[PDB]
Design a protein around this ligand. Structure first.
Ligand SMILES: [Zn+2]
Ligand SMILES: [Zn+2]
Lengths: 50, 65, 343, 103, 51, 46
């Protein structure tokens, strides 16, 4: 529910003001998933990373 | 993913009415009269319940189980 | 005349076609010559009054006459933020195999209200994560989804295929601490709605967790807000500049709300009149009809505020308002004590 | 440490005073502003917020004559407390009679 | 079962069909849309008239 | 120490030691996940 208006002058140039309670109730909640890969390969000699 | 418990704008408990809205949909009630009977006067809760997509079952279909 | 204009400016708030006028409170000493607007406790107590028009479970509506917009907004904001309640804060998980993320589950559980009476608890001091019997409540949630041993061959519906596949808030079990079992009777400490859908599971998944809830105000986080919608609006008072009759009466009835303008046949002809300006919401649809613009005068009463408070069910709205006023009085007393200690 | 006083300058003039109040918001600021504006012995009264990040407000009171500007503050606080008590009693009586006439 | 209900009565209730066949809402909706249309305050009606 | 894992399709608890061909019984799927820990984890509802 967006309201087009100026409030507190914190929306001067293309900025917007969010509601603390709305953000607390789950609005805009995002999840960032990253991957960390590791490899344990065998070399020419009969030895392996452990 | 799942219906939120609280509404973003106001904060009325709406997660408990998701199954009731689904039942009203399975019934002959339309979206408008269903949301009216559910007790949602202000349009914020109506939007919360209407614009919500049910993906929890789509994810459980892929869950390990 | 000038006196009528001053009276209107000081009493009513007129809403124009393009903008609202007379929106600032001016009833103060020195602003008016022919009016002694100095503070008078006697006149305030004489003119002030409260009338409840509707009061049901988790819903209240009451008109306050004599109060000012400043104190009205103060009460509203106190009810919205400065009323302490109980809400899940800490979540200890034990082998949660649910598809829902742990953080999202904790947030949903925190958003669940608690029917516990906050006046019987206190705020947790800085730190002390272990919690004490006075300022903590424990709710256990252990749900293990499994296949139904007895079901149809197809069982295309999950309701018949699996059991406990939807973890509702009714599965929460309040675990007493110390003498809380003796203090609070059985059935008091429980979820408010008892039907909030937390998550959905599948056979093999299990949700095991413990929720520690403490006392907190809505200003810190929205989960402590007891009131779902606590607002106030000025009383509308629609007045007709000239008697409107004929099909113009039905036009007025269709332009304004169906429950504010009523048509009557006093002499065989339909004439419109204001029945109950409470139901009117000032849709400003009368400005569309060119002829019916200069026949009505929409206005809001400055000293008449209808407060509507719909709560989430933690405690009734009358007690919510009482606690809000008590918190305001406590703030005033704290400031007075600080000033006395300073001087 | 909650409410602290400040003079207008190094001269320590009591006609103009600034009260800095911590852990507060617009609610009490506007309430006290409205309750003290009706005091005929106040030339100027104005509350402001330093920054939305920190929870503190600053009220400024300039009196007419030689008022210390602390007695008007105390008067406003007492009037606000009295109004709160009166509205609380009125609402309690209203709810009581409403329940009585409903039952 | 849906075709039998339609032959017995022109108006079929989606909720009754679902409760009887123990099937899911999406499958019932597909079965009903394959041979009928939605009518307000009356349920599901056969797409073609009585020939 | 018995190290346990879960299969990607059978979802059965399999115990394998170090330096073993990653496989699962009664199937041939080569995706093996690790079960969730048993330690106590604290979460904040904020
Ligand atoms: Zn809402
Ligand atoms: Zn396997």
């Amino acid at each position: 529910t967006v309201a087009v208006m100026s409030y507190s002058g914190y929306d001067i140039e293309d900025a917007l003001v969010l509601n603390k309670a709305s953000l607390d109730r789950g609005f805009g909640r995002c999840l960032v998933y990253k991957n960390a890969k590791c490899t344990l390969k065998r070399y020419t000699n009969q030895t392996f990373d452990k | 993913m799942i219906i939120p418990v609280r509404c973003f704008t106001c904060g009325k408990i709406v997660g408990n009415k998701w199954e009731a809205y689904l039942g009203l949909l399975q019934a002959e009630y339309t979206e408008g009269d269903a949301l009216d009977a559910l007790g949602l006067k202000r349009y914020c809760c109506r939007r919360m319940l209407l614009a919500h997509v049910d993906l929890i079952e789509k994810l459980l279909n892929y869950a390990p189980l | 005349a000038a006196s009528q204009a001053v009276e209107e400016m000081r009493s009513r708030v007129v809403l124009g076609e393009f903008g609202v006028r007379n929106v600032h409170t001016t009833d103060f000493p020195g602003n008016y010559s022919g009016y002694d607007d100095a503070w008078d406790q006697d006149r305030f107590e004489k003119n002030f009054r409260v009338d409840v028009v509707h009061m049901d479970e988790n819903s209240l509506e009451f008109d306050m006459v004599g109060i000012d917009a400043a104190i009205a907004n103060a009460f509203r904001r106190i009810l919205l933020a400065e009323v302490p309640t109980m809400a899940v804060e800490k979540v200890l998980v034990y082998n949660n195999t649910s598809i829902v993320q742990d953080e999202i589950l904790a947030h949903r559980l925190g958003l669940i209200p608690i029917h516990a009476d906050p006046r019987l608890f206190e705020y947790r001091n800085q730190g002390d994560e272990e919690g004490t019997e006075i300022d903590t409540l424990q709710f256990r949630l252990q749900v293990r989804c499994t296949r139904n041993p007895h079901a149809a061959k197809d069982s295309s519906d999950p309701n018949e295929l699996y059991v406990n596949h939807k973890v509702y808030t009714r599965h929460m079990t309040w675990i007493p601490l110390g003498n809380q079992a003796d203090l609070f009777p059985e059935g008091t400490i429980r979820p408010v709605h008892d039907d909030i859908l937390i998550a959905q599971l599948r056979p093999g998944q299990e949700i095991d967790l413990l929720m520690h809830c403490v006392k907190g105000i809505g200003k810190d986080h929205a989960k402590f807000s007891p009131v779902a919608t606590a607002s106030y609006r000025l009383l509308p008072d629609i007045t007709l500049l000239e008697p409107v009759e004929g099909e113009a009466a039905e036009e007025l009835s269709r332009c304004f709300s169906p429950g504010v303008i009523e048509v009557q046949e006093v002499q065989g002809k339909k004439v419109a009149r204001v029945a109950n300006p409470r139901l009117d919401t000032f849709s400003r649809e009368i400005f569309r009809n060119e002829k019916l613009k200069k026949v009505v005068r929409l206005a809001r009463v400055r000293d008449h505020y209808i407060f509507s408070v719909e709560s989430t069910g933690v405690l009734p709205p009358d007690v919510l308002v009482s606690e809000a006023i008590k918190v305001l009085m406590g703030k005033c007393r704290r400031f007075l004590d600080e000033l006395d200690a300073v001087q | 440490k909650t409410a602290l006083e400040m003079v207008q300058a190094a001269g320590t003039d009591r006609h103009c005073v600034t009260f800095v109040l911590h852990e507060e918001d617009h609610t009490l600021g506007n309430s006290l502003r409205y309750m003290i504006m009706k005091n005929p012995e106040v030339e100027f009264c104005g509350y402001t917020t330093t920054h939305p990040s920190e929870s503190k407000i600053n009220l400024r009171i300039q009196t007419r004559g030689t008022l210390p500007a602390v007695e008007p503050f105390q008067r406003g606080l007492n009037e606000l407390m009295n109004v709160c008590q009166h509205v609380l009693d009125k609402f309690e009586a209203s709810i009581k009679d409403y329940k009585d006439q409903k039952a | 079962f849906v075709m039998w209900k339609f032959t017995q009565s022109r108006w079929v209730v989606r909720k009754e069909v679902a409760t009887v066949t123990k099937l899911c809402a999406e499958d019932v909706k597909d079965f009903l849309e394959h041979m009928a249309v939605v009518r307000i305050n009356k349920g599901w009606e056969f797409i073609l008239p009585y020939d | 120490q018995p190290m346990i894992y879960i299969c990607g399709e059978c979802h059965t608890e399999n115990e394998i030691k170090s330096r073993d061909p990653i496989r699962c019984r009664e199937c041939g799927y080569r995706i093996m996940y690790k079960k969730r820990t048993k330690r106590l984890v604290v979460f904040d509802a904020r």
